[PDB]
Structure formats: C-alpha cells, structure tokens
Design an enzyme around this catalytic site. Structure first.
Site, PDB file in Angstrom:
ATOM      1  N   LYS A 175       1.119  -0.745   0.063  1.00  0.00           N
ATOM      2  CA  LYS A 175       0.046   0.215  -0.020  1.00  0.00           C
ATOM      3  C   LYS A 175       0.951   0.680   0.353  1.00  0.00           C
ATOM      4  O   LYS A 175       2.118   1.054   0.806  1.00  0.00           O
ATOM      5  CB  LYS A 175      -0.795  -0.016   1.374  1.00  0.00           C
ATOM      6  CG  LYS A 175      -2.103  -0.978   1.065  1.00  0.00           C
ATOM      7  CD  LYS A 175      -3.074  -0.929   2.381  1.00  0.00           C
ATOM      8  CE  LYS A 175      -3.883  -2.042   2.252  1.00  0.00           C
ATOM      9  NZ  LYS A 175      -4.799  -2.128   3.575  1.00  0.00           N
ATOM     10  N   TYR A 218     -12.274  -2.929  -3.258  1.00  0.00           N
ATOM     11  CA  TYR A 218     -12.487  -2.950  -2.094  1.00  0.00           C
ATOM     12  C   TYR A 218     -14.553  -2.933  -2.138  1.00  0.00           C
ATOM     13  O   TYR A 218     -14.870  -2.050  -1.929  1.00  0.00           O
ATOM     14  CB  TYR A 218     -12.299  -1.703  -0.694  1.00  0.00           C
ATOM     15  CG  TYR A 218     -10.999  -1.734  -0.423  1.00  0.00           C
ATOM     16  CD1 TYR A 218     -10.456  -3.307   0.019  1.00  0.00           C
ATOM     17  CD2 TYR A 218      -9.978  -1.270  -0.798  1.00  0.00           C
ATOM     18  CE1 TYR A 218      -8.928  -3.052   0.639  1.00  0.00           C
ATOM     19  CE2 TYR A 218      -8.345  -1.507  -0.922  1.00  0.00           C
ATOM     20  CZ  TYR A 218      -8.663  -2.206  -0.384  1.00  0.00           C
ATOM     21  OH  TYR A 218      -6.766  -2.518   0.395  1.00  0.00           O
ATOM     22  N   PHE A 262     -15.194   3.592   6.935  1.00  0.00           N
ATOM     23  CA  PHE A 262     -14.363   4.117   6.764  1.00  0.00           C
ATOM     24  C   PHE A 262     -13.710   3.854   5.147  1.00  0.00           C
ATOM     25  O   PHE A 262     -12.700   3.992   4.856  1.00  0.00           O
ATOM     26  CB  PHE A 262     -13.129   2.863   7.603  1.00  0.00           C
ATOM     27  CG  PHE A 262     -13.403   1.442   7.632  1.00  0.00           C
ATOM     28  CD1 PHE A 262     -12.597   1.177   6.300  1.00  0.00           C
ATOM     29  CD2 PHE A 262     -13.891   0.380   8.172  1.00  0.00           C
ATOM     30  CE1 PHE A 262     -12.298  -0.409   6.074  1.00  0.00           C
ATOM     31  CE2 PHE A 262     -14.379  -0.132   7.940  1.00  0.00           C
ATOM     32  CZ  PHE A 262     -13.423  -1.359   6.698  1.00  0.00           C
ATOM     33  N   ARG A 306      -1.476 -14.563   4.245  1.00  0.00           N
ATOM     34  CA  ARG A 306      -2.368 -13.604   5.290  1.00  0.00           C
ATOM     35  C   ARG A 306      -0.946 -13.903   6.366  1.00  0.00           C
ATOM     36  O   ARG A 306      -1.182 -13.040   7.233  1.00  0.00           O
ATOM     37  CB  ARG A 306      -3.647 -13.738   5.012  1.00  0.00           C
ATOM     38  CG  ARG A 306      -4.543 -13.378   4.141  1.00  0.00           C
ATOM     39  CD  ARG A 306      -5.053 -12.391   3.680  1.00  0.00           C
ATOM     40  NE  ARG A 306      -6.195 -12.525   4.874  1.00  0.00           N
ATOM     41  CZ  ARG A 306      -6.759 -11.578   4.240  1.00  0.00           C
ATOM     42  NH1 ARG A 306      -6.809 -10.823   3.337  1.00  0.00           N
ATOM     43  NH2 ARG A 306      -7.979 -11.296   5.528  1.00  0.00           N
ATOM     44  N   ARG A 338       2.927  -6.649   9.367  1.00  0.00           N
ATOM     45  CA  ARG A 338       2.261  -5.791   9.971  1.00  0.00           C
ATOM     46  C   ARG A 338       2.976  -5.930  11.459  1.00  0.00           C
ATOM     47  O   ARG A 338       2.909  -4.960  12.349  1.00  0.00           O
ATOM     48  CB  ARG A 338       0.930  -6.352  10.199  1.00  0.00           C
ATOM     49  CG  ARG A 338       0.867  -5.591   8.333  1.00  0.00           C
ATOM     50  CD  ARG A 338      -1.257  -5.902   8.367  1.00  0.00           C
ATOM     51  NE  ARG A 338      -1.865  -5.905   6.925  1.00  0.00           N
ATOM     52  CZ  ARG A 338      -2.445  -6.254   6.711  1.00  0.00           C
ATOM     53  NH1 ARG A 338      -3.238  -7.608   7.359  1.00  0.00           N
ATOM     54  NH2 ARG A 338      -2.618  -6.566   5.261  1.00  0.00           N
ATOM     55  N   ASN A 376      -2.359  -0.470   7.295  1.00  0.00           N
ATOM     56  CA  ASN A 376      -1.060  -1.889   7.876  1.00  0.00           C
ATOM     57  C   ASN A 376      -0.561  -1.939   6.470  1.00  0.00           C
ATOM     58  O   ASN A 376      -0.033  -3.381   6.461  1.00  0.00           O
ATOM     59  CB  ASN A 376      -2.786  -2.422   8.230  1.00  0.00           C
ATOM     60  CG  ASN A 376      -2.980  -2.589   6.631  1.00  0.00           C
ATOM     61  OD1 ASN A 376      -3.612  -1.226   5.456  1.00  0.00           O
ATOM     62  ND2 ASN A 376      -3.990  -3.678   6.534  1.00  0.00           N
ATOM     63  N   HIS A 390      -1.799  -5.613   1.592  1.00  0.00           N
ATOM     64  CA  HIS A 390      -2.579  -5.951   1.398  1.00  0.00           C
ATOM     65  C   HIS A 390      -2.703  -7.575   0.934  1.00  0.00           C
ATOM     66  O   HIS A 390      -1.681  -8.015  -0.139  1.00  0.00           O
ATOM     67  CB  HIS A 390      -3.508  -5.477   0.351  1.00  0.00           C
ATOM     68  CG  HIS A 390      -4.743  -5.686  -0.519  1.00  0.00           C
ATOM     69  ND1 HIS A 390      -5.584  -6.345   0.359  1.00  0.00           N
ATOM     70  CD2 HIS A 390      -4.678  -6.656  -1.727  1.00  0.00           C
ATOM     71  CE1 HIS A 390      -6.781  -6.908  -0.665  1.00  0.00           C
ATOM     72  NE2 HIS A 390      -5.802  -7.034  -1.802  1.00  0.00           N
ATOM     73  N   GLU A 435      -9.146 -10.489  -7.995  1.00  0.00           N
ATOM     74  CA  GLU A 435      -8.178  -9.641  -7.825  1.00  0.00           C
ATOM     75  C   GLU A 435      -6.614  -9.215  -8.793  1.00  0.00           C
ATOM     76  O   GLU A 435      -6.305  -8.504  -9.084  1.00  0.00           O
ATOM     77  CB  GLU A 435      -7.644  -9.610  -6.390  1.00  0.00           C
ATOM     78  CG  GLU A 435      -8.551  -9.004  -5.372  1.00  0.00           C
ATOM     79  CD  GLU A 435      -7.938  -9.303  -3.801  1.00  0.00           C
ATOM     80  OE1 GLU A 435      -6.709  -9.542  -3.869  1.00  0.00           O
ATOM     81  OE2 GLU A 435      -8.517  -8.674  -3.005  1.00  0.00           O
TER      82      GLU A 435
HETATM   83  N1  LIG Z   1     -11.351   0.362  11.120  1.00  0.00           N
HETATM   84  C1  LIG Z   1     -10.748   0.926   9.772  1.00  0.00           C
HETATM   85  N2  LIG Z   1     -10.288   2.164  10.133  1.00  0.00           N
HETATM   86  C2  LIG Z   1      -9.423   1.782   8.628  1.00  0.00           C
HETATM   87  N3  LIG Z   1      -9.618   1.405   7.759  1.00  0.00           N
HETATM   88  C3  LIG Z   1      -9.926   0.079   7.799  1.00  0.00           C
HETATM   89  C4  LIG Z   1     -10.657  -0.748   9.503  1.00  0.00           C
HETATM   90  N4  LIG Z   1     -10.706  -1.716   8.716  1.00  0.00           N
HETATM   91  C5  LIG Z   1     -10.214  -2.155   8.033  1.00  0.00           C
HETATM   92  N5  LIG Z   1      -9.658  -0.842   7.356  1.00  0.00           N
HETATM   93  C6  LIG Z   1      -8.729  -1.128   6.032  1.00  0.00           C
HETATM   94  O1  LIG Z   1      -9.619  -1.712   5.339  1.00  0.00           O
HETATM   95  C7  LIG Z   1      -8.601  -2.479   3.930  1.00  0.00           C
HETATM   96  C8  LIG Z   1      -9.894  -3.668   4.001  1.00  0.00           C
HETATM   97  O2  LIG Z   1      -9.660  -4.871   4.924  1.00  0.00           O
HETATM   98  P1  LIG Z   1      -9.987  -6.321   4.699  1.00  0.00           P
HETATM   99  O3  LIG Z   1     -10.466  -6.640   3.637  1.00  0.00           O
HETATM  100  O4  LIG Z   1     -11.887  -6.197   5.988  1.00  0.00           O
HETATM  101  O5  LIG Z   1      -9.414  -6.653   5.716  1.00  0.00           O
HETATM  102  P2  LIG Z   1      -7.386  -7.375   4.763  1.00  0.00           P
HETATM  103  O6  LIG Z   1      -7.404  -6.026   3.969  1.00  0.00           O
HETATM  104  O7  LIG Z   1      -6.999  -7.745   5.960  1.00  0.00           O
HETATM  105  O8  LIG Z   1      -8.454  -8.756   4.382  1.00  0.00           O
HETATM  106  C9  LIG Z   1      -8.018  -3.518   5.282  1.00  0.00           C
HETATM  107  O9  LIG Z   1      -6.398  -3.289   4.549  1.00  0.00           O
HETATM  108  C10 LIG Z   1      -7.369  -1.737   5.879  1.00  0.00           C
HETATM  109  O10 LIG Z   1      -6.218  -0.711   6.176  1.00  0.00           O
END
Ligand SMILES: Nc1ncnc2c1ncn2[C@@H]1O[C@H](COP(=O)(O)OP(=O)(O)O)[C@@H](O)[C@H]1O
Ligand SMILES: Nc1ncnc2c1ncn2[C@@H]1O[C@H](COP(=O)(O)OP(=O)(O)O)[C@@H](O)[C@H]1O
Ligand SMILES: Nc1ncnc2c1ncn2[C@@H]1O[C@H](COP(=O)(O)OP(=O)(O)O)[C@@H](O)[C@H]1O
Ligand SMILES: Nc1ncnc2c1ncn2[C@@H]1O[C@H](COP(=O)(O)OP(=O)(O)O)[C@@H](O)[C@H]1O
Ligand SMILES: Nc1ncnc2c1ncn2[C@@H]1O[C@H](COP(=O)(O)OP(=O)(O)O)[C@@H](O)[C@H]1O
Ligand SMILES: Nc1ncnc2c1ncn2[C@@H]1O[C@H](COP(=O)(O)OP(=O)(O)O)[C@@H](O)[C@H]1O
Lengths: 152, 152, 152, 152, 152, 152
Positions: free
Chosen positions: A12, A52, A60, A88, A105, A115, A118, A129
C-alpha cells in the site's frame, strides 16, 4: 492443494513511502513462493473502489479509497502451495495491534488504516483481484531452479 | 487510542553486554514508534529498587537489583498509539522460555533473570517509570516526517 | 546535478532465480533513491538485442542475449541525484571478481556472465534504456515523505 | 532446567541447497545457545533409517530416507537450558503450513517433506541422535564469554 | 594504538528522521567498539555553532547550524583502539557521492548536507567534542565481556 | 578460471566466541560459493604450528598459537571460481585497521591478533591447508541446484 495456487499481494502507499518494498518482497521470496507478476502502479479511484467493493458500506470506505490513492502501489502476484492462506499469515492480522512480531504488520505497522500491505483472503477473491489489477500478459511463466527443493 | 502514548523501554546490562542495542532499537524503530528520550546510564541502587518496588519482598529481588547494577542500561522513552501494550508484545514473555520467536526475548534471551530488556506493563506505571528515569527536559519534542503514513 | 535524474536498473534472470529481488531493491531504497517504475517482464529477443546493440560484435553477445531470455527480469527506474553514477557504484564492477564487498555484485555474483543486475552507464543511455523498456505511463509521479531529509 | 542440556539440530539437504546454513545457525547463535559440535556430512542409508526408526511404518518413510540422501546435511549439536524444547519452537511446526512467521520453517519452508531442518523432540531422543550422528570426540568443550550474561 | 581511545559519533537529524538510529549503532557495536555514552538531545544554537566553529567562514555554515537544529540528534561516545580513524572510515566520505557501499553514508546518504551522521576527525577534536556535548558523569565506565576476544 | 577451485576458510576462536559463525558463513554462501566441508574442531598445537609454519620465528608466533588453542575453530572448505583470491577479499586486510567496511574484518574486527577469520593466501597453500585440516572423506561431493545461475 496445488503448488500453482496464486494470490494477490499489494504494498500500500504507506508501505512504499516508508521504504518497505524490499523487506516485504523478501518475506515471500525467502519463504519459497514464486513472483510471477509485479508492477508499480497508481490505479484510478474506480479500480480501487472495485477492489474494496465488498466494503462500500463501511464508514471507513471513503478514507480507505483516498488513502490508497495518496501514493504508488507495488502490485504483485505470488504463486505457491497454499499461498493465499500462508500469505495472510505472513502479512499478519488486519489490525497490526493484533498482529504478532515476525509478520509484516507485526514488524512495521501500527494503525489498521496504515497496515502497509494487502493480501487476498480467498482463492476466489485472489482470482478476481489478479484479473482486476493485472493483464493476462503480465503474468510471467517460469520455473524456479529450486522448485524440487521447496516442494515434495 | 492516543498516538502520543509513551512507554519506558530499557535495555538491561546483559542486552548491552551482548551487543543488542542496535537490533533492539530497530524493533521499535521499524514498527513506527517515535524515540523521544534515550540515554545510557548506570543508575544508583535506590533508583533501581524504586523501579522494582512492587517486587521488594520477592526472593529474586536482591539478585535482580545487583544484576541491574552490574552494567550500563540504555533507558528509552518510546511514543506511539498503544506503545505500552504493543511494546510488551515486541519484547515477548517475561520468561523467554514462554516467548515466541520474532520477539526480542524470543530471538535473544533464554533465562528470565537475563531477559535482556524491560518494558512498562501499564500506562500509569509507564508515566511513573518515565518520571523516575528521565528529567522532563530530557524528553525531546519532535514530529516524525512519516507520521501521516504511520497513522491515519 | 539535479535530484530528478533517472537511471535504468534491471535484475537479470540469474538474480531473480537466486532470490535477490528483495535485497537488490533494498540497496537503492535504503540509499534514498525513489522508485518511479518497476515491472516483472520477459522481453523479446529483439528488445534485448537492442538493449545491448553496442555489443553486437562482442564474442559473448550470442550467449548474453540467450541468457537474458532464460528467465524473468525485474526492470526498474530509480530517480535521484547522480543516480546513474551512484547506481553503478552500488552494483559494483562489471566483473564481480573485480567488485568490492558491500556492493551488489561484491556480495552475490562471481561470473561476469552472471552478474545478477544491470545499470545504465550514462544519463543518455539511461534515457534510451528507459524509453526502450518502459512506456511513459509506467513512470509513476510522486514525492517521498522524506525528500527534504535526503536532499538539501 | 540445567544449562548443559544438548539437542541435535540438522540442516536437511533442501536447507543446504537453498543457502540457509548461515541464517539457521544465526537463529540459535543469537538466542544464546552454544555450538559444541558441527560437521557437513553425507551419512549412509543405514544411519538415516536409524534416525527415523520410529517412522519405519510410515508410507513416506522410504521417500524421506531417499531425500535425506540426495544432498549434504549440516549436523549440529547445540547446548543450553531447555535447548530441546526451545529448539523445536525456533524451528517451527513440522508442517510449515502450521508454522508461525519468525520461526525457521515459518520464514523459509512450505512443504512438510521440505522443512529444511530437523530438531530432537526430547532429551532422550537428543542423546540417542547425538550418539548416532557424532563421535564423542567431535563435541567440543568450551565456555562462552557471555555465559554469565545469558544465564543467571 | 591504545584501546581506550574515544570518539564522538552523532546521528544528525536526517538520520533520526529516516529511522537509522538502530542500523548506525549496530555498525559500531558489531565492529567491537564500546558505547560509553549516549543520549538523544536537542542542543542549543550556541553549542552547534561551537561544534562547527572551524567552518564559521563557510557559506553553508548558517544553513548547517539551522538544519542541525531542525530535529533531535543521537549523541554518542564510542571507545576503542583507533576508534577515531576507523570511525571515520565506517561513516564514509563526507560527500556521499564519493563514499563507498558498505559505509554508513555509502548505504544511506546522498547529499553532503544530509550525510545522516557525524564523527570526530582527530583525537584532539574528539576530546573537544566529547567535552562539549557530554558532561563527564554521562560517560559510563564498564568492561565488555568480549574485551579479551576483541583485543590482544 | 576453474569453478572447482577450493580454499580453506576457518573461523578463529574469537569469531566463534563473539557469535559470528552465522554471518561469516552467509558471506560466502550469499556470494555463490559451495560449502564442501565444515567441522567445529579444537586442533592440537602441532597442527596449528604446522598451519602457521612460515611464521615460526615471528615474534607473535607463540601468542598466535596459544590464541588459536584458546577456543573452538570452525574449519571450512569453500569451492568456487577464484574462491581463494575472492575469499581473501571477503575477509578483508589482515590488519582490520586497513580493512574496508563491507568485508568480514571491516565489519567485525579491530586488532590484527583478533582478526576473527583465516583464509588461504594461494591455491597451493589452500591445497596444503585443506589436506592438513580435513580428511579426504570429509569433503562432500554435491552439485548446487543454482550452479548454472551462478556460472555461465
Ligand atoms: N476500522 C478501520 N479503519 C480504517 N481502515 C480500515 C478499518 N478496517 C479495515 N480498514 C482497511 O480496509 C482494508 C480492508 O480490510 P479487510 O479486507 O476487512 O481485511 P484485510 O484487508 O486484512 O483482508 C484493510 O487493509 C485496512 O487497511
Ligand atoms: N523467577 C524469577 N527469577 C529471576 N528473575 C526474575 C524472576 N521473575 C522476574 N524476574 C526479573 O524481574 C523483572 C521484573 O519482572 P516483572 O516486572 O514481573 O515482569 P516484566 O519485566 O515482564 O514486567 C523481570 O524483567 C525479570 O528480569
Ligand atoms: N567477457 C564476458 N563474458 C560474458 N559476459 C559478459 C562479458 N563481458 C560482459 N558481459 C555481460 O554483458 C553485459 C554488458 O556489459 P557492459 O555493458 O560492457 O558493462 P555493464 O553492463 O556493467 O555496464 C554485462 O552485464 C555482462 O553480464
Ligand atoms: N505427511 C508427511 N509427508 C512427507 N513427509 C513427512 C510427513 N510427515 C513427516 N514428514 C517428514 O518426516 C520427518 C520426521 O517427522 P516428525 O519427526 O514426525 O516431525 P519432526 O521432524 O518435527 O519431529 C519430518 O521432518 C518431515 O520432513
Ligand atoms: N559543500 C557543502 N554544502 C553543504 N554542507 C556541507 C558542505 N560541506 C560540508 N557540509 C556539512 O558540514 C559538515 C562538516 O563538514 P566537515 O567537518 O568538513 O566533514 P566531516 O563532517 O566529514 O568532518 C558535514 O557533516 C556536512 O554535513
Ligand atoms: N603483527 C602481528 N601481531 C599479532 N598477530 C599477527 C600479526 N601479524 C599477523 N598476525 C596473525 O597471524 C595470522 C597469520 O598472518 P598472515 O598469514 O601473514 O596473514 P593472513 O592471515 O591474512 O594470511 C593472521 O591471521 C593474524 O591473526
């Protein structure tokens, strides 16, 4: 499963700005996975909103998309047995506050909104994706010289 | 929650003797925490006994104090969101026998009496340790150039 | 000269096969140079013969081209002050037998025909190699958050 | 509980082939354990079959012995308090899919049949494995200069 | 020639801002030099002007003092045989363009005005710089456990 | 010229005592050389005196021999093109005062009497040292999986 399984890993914009491109690639490279596609890209907002799309109702979401647009992204496709689930595990928990040291992370990130990286959460989402981020010609076909030493 | 939370991290004399100052600092530095105060000190016995005051009647108290007097200590104050709890996670379990690889004690320590580093166990104990080891002017106020990439 | 100078760095197929993508990228990343373009590619033979067109009369030309075709290549464009000359210094001497430890070839390469990486030898050749390997849209425009700390 | 406990760590042929001798040794060396015996050997078939005698009824037994014969092995004896149990934790789970990042297999391995390393699972089996792989004269007796800093 | 020689090493604000405190300390720590004093300080303007008093007639003097005031500095005193001369070699050439890979500036710096670190250039200037930056009580006297293994 | 050239590399007792076995092995391992023999030994005085026979009447001969007897030695045989000359370059100058950073002695050593490692100075001396320290059966014959990527 099969050793030809592929996943989508993306560094990212916060990971690029903090100089973590080398270390992150080394995590997958030293584990034994094969890099079959990689490119530095700044995707449009519509592509990131499709990436997303499952989180379009999250509060968010607006901040997540604009943050993914604030810098370049190192998009990668790694190939290996169980590379989706193991990938992961290498990244760590989504919230780095819950991630363990030794993961990406767990070693570099603090905020969930920052974080660093991705990773695809399933084989089906990985295929969606990969096709969304990469053209089919950008997937390079080759065999590692140590394939028979990494896999049985 | 608050990104300006502070914790007290100290490299114990065994960590200094074994050449672990660099790698231990890199653990917190690469994670994204801000170093606001640091000094190499040989504190008096009373300060060390006041630091471990809650352990005054423990059987290992006298040995702990004299071992903390046997060499220099790298006292530090790190600042970041949840730096107290995450800092303890970075250090690993108090007994490195129970610590996981990837943590400081999980990579460098074996004996609980020689666990290399110290970290504040709570926010209130952190404030008390910071005031015990550091004068207020020894805490440096500055803004990291990558603050907005570590925190959302 | 100018801090916007660009050079072309490519990880040759031997560097990819031996798992040196991470370490090599870290050399330029830790030095302070900015990655503005990167992609994993397997170029055609005609493109590699144009890349080494100045060496078409060398006896090792036929083996050099076929070796550059034996695997994927990580093509990169790095931007920074004196990045062409400094980039060559980071890579090391063309023959790694003459390279010093601490450089890429001084740490990883032995044979001149397997020197892991490539770097532009001049600003003019860098522009010719960048246009040959990358499309203009693949050059990502961004500013590092630590630009004012790397450059005066 | 005693600091003179010994375990047998062996870098399997895939670990040697993938250039992991250095990193694996550093894992135990940086933790504080003492190397008392080490050699690069290619043992006969009967020695490897005795090493895995408890798995002679496993279907993968014949393939395990054959793969352990396909390359050199770096046989080692490490000494330290709880070095058997802690050594297993450093190596990670037998199946790298279940191993955690920060361990040897969690950082370097993927397949259960290519987990790059071996470690004794008990003090009794360690003594049996040490007597099988090493002559008593090959165990070097020495005192680490940092012994009193690793152990209380 | 004597092992008690001391030099003043200081991590400049750009080195602190770019997260290089850990790596720079490891360079001297792994070489065998002993850290006898260290602190994170933000010195007043008059101290930095005295530090570079010999360059008061340089055109870049005012900008040098201002940039050295723009962030925290990690002031250190390292002790060892020929630590002044060897310390300068570890840092690299003043201009990072002329520095070699493997040195601090050769691995991390680009601009002469952002060379991330400082080191005393002579034993006489080291004593003057140590007396300027540190109180005598801040230099910790201790004996390294590996002293007899670093020195004959 | 010949890719099967062999040299004798030995980690001296100070290198073993200071925990440098891992990093030193990684220097030759990452460069692309093949480890064909290795063992941790405590050789008798006569063998060490025969090893340094050309220095029998040097003033430091007695001190050199007793220091080489004071701890275990990691004796190795590395194979590769020009491994003798390049191996010496990897070690650095005999006096680490004159050694450059990026080499073994340039990163880890200070005193010439404690220069951490040994390397054969010529091909003929290498053959004599290899036969002195290792029995013929202790040299392991194997083919690296990346031999064709290290050598053209
Ligand atoms: N509460 C939050 N506040 C801000 N950003 C968030 C939050 N939850 C998730 N994100 C961001 O949205 C992205 C999508 O998360 P998610 O797809 O649910 O888990 P992952 O990406 O780890 O599989 C994450 O990489 C994270 O950076
Ligand atoms: N059983 C023990 N024997 C020897 N030393 C101990 C023992 N328990 C704790 N210590 C030492 O006392 C210090 C204080 O322990 P404690 O504060 O309870 O754990 P932590 O340091 O993780 O907060 C520890 O860092 C450890 O070095
Ligand atoms: N004598 C040789 N034998 C085999 N390959 C060579 C030889 N000389 C050069 N090469 C290869 O050809 C490439 C072009 O070399 P050149 O452009 O002259 O130097 P550089 O690439 O370091 O600027 C090198 O990267 C090297 O891999
Ligand atoms: N299901 C399997 N398939 C292939 N190889 C296996 C399997 N299970 C174990 N092995 C191999 O046999 C070796 C012995 O396994 P075991 O002793 O049970 O685990 P460990 O080596 O962790 O003690 C392992 O190192 C592994 O390489
Ligand atoms: N031409 C220049 N432009 C800008 N800054 C400079 C220049 N020359 C030197 N400096 C700065 O002034 C500091 C003092 O330089 P000097 O003492 O001559 O080198 P060193 O610090 O290696 O002893 C250097 O660390 C450098 O950051
Ligand atoms: N002047 C000296 N004082 C103490 N020890 C020395 C001195 N010169 C050489 N030695 C030791 O003797 C060993 C043999 O030196 P020599 O063979 O001449 O150099 P090299 O080891 O680089 O081949 C060296 O590794 C060094 O440790």
């Amino acid at each position: 499963s099969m050793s030809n399984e592929q996943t989508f890993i993306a560094i990212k914009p916060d990971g690029v700005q903090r100089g973590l491109i080398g270390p992150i690639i080394s995590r997958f490279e030293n584990r034994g996975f094969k890099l079959v596609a990689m490119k530095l890209v700044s995707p449009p907002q519509s592509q990131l909103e499709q990436h997303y799309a499952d989180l379009s109702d999250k509060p968010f979401f607006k901040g997540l998309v604009s943050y993914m647009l604030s810098g370049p992204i190192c998009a990668m496709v790694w190939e290996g047995r169980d590379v989706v689930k193991t990938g992961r595990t290498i990244l760590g928990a989504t919230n780095p506050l819950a991630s363990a040291p030794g993961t990406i992370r767990g070693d570099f990130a603090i905020d969930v909104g920052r974080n660093v990286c991705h990773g695809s959460d399933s084989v089906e989402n990985a295929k969606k994706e990969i096709a969304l981020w990469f053209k089919p010609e950008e997937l390079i076909s080759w065999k590692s010289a140590t394939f028979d030493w990494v896999y049985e």
